[PDB]
Amino acid sequence: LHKEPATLIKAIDGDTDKLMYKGQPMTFRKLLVDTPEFNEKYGPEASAFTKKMVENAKKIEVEFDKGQRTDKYGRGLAYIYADGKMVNEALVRQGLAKVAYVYKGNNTHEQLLRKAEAQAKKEKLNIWS
Numbered sequence: 633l634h635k636e637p638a639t640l641i642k643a644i645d646g647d648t649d650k651l652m653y654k655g656q657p658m659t660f661r662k663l664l665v666d667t668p669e670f671n672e673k674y675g676p677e678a679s680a681f682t683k684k685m686v687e688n689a690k691k692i693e694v695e696f697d698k699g700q701r702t703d704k705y706g707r708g709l710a711y712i713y714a715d716g717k718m719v720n721e722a723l724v725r726q727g728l729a730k731v732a733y734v735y736k737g738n739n740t741h742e743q744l745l746r747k748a749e750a751q752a753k754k755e756k757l758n759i760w761s
């Protein structure tokens with residue numbers, strides 16, 4: 633997989649961000665994760681976590697997997713990176729997202745995230761408390 637540049641247009645919630653990619657605006661949905669919606673427990677905290685990460689980053693990057701790049705809703709499917717740190721992984725490690733939506737052909741980082749989830753659960757963090 634390769635990292636590609638993107639610029640933050642607007643943080644939306646734990647799972648999504650409006651980004652400029654190849655000079656066009658696009659909602660990006662994080663691969664391999666499911667965060668609670670704002671109205672659910674830890675939803676607000678998830679949104680806040682990701683917002684801070686992407687807003688404070690000097691460099692935002694997107695990494696497509698080997699499979700589908702856009703979902704049924706026109707959203708880009710990618711690993712999102714803030715100053716080299718994957719937001720997808722960080723959410724799971726902090727117990728603010730579960731590993732989810734793992735489809736064949738789009739699961740390069742499955743094990744990495746699952747490892748993070750186990751550590752979050754072991755630490756009884758957030759979703760796991």
Ligand SMILES: Cc1cn([C@H]2C[C@H](OP(=O)(O)O)[C@@H](COP(=O)(O)O)O2)c(=O)[nH]c1=O
Nearest residue numbers: 647661662663664665666703704709733738
């Ligand atoms: C993460 C992800 C979600 N999606 C779709 C499946 C789910 O369909 P449904 O909308 O029919 O439930 C939905 C979940 O996204 P959200 O979790 O943002 O709602 O997005 C994919 O198709 N591929 C993916 O990799």
Ligand SMILES: [Ca+2]
Nearest residue numbers: 647666667668
């Ligand atoms: Ca969600």
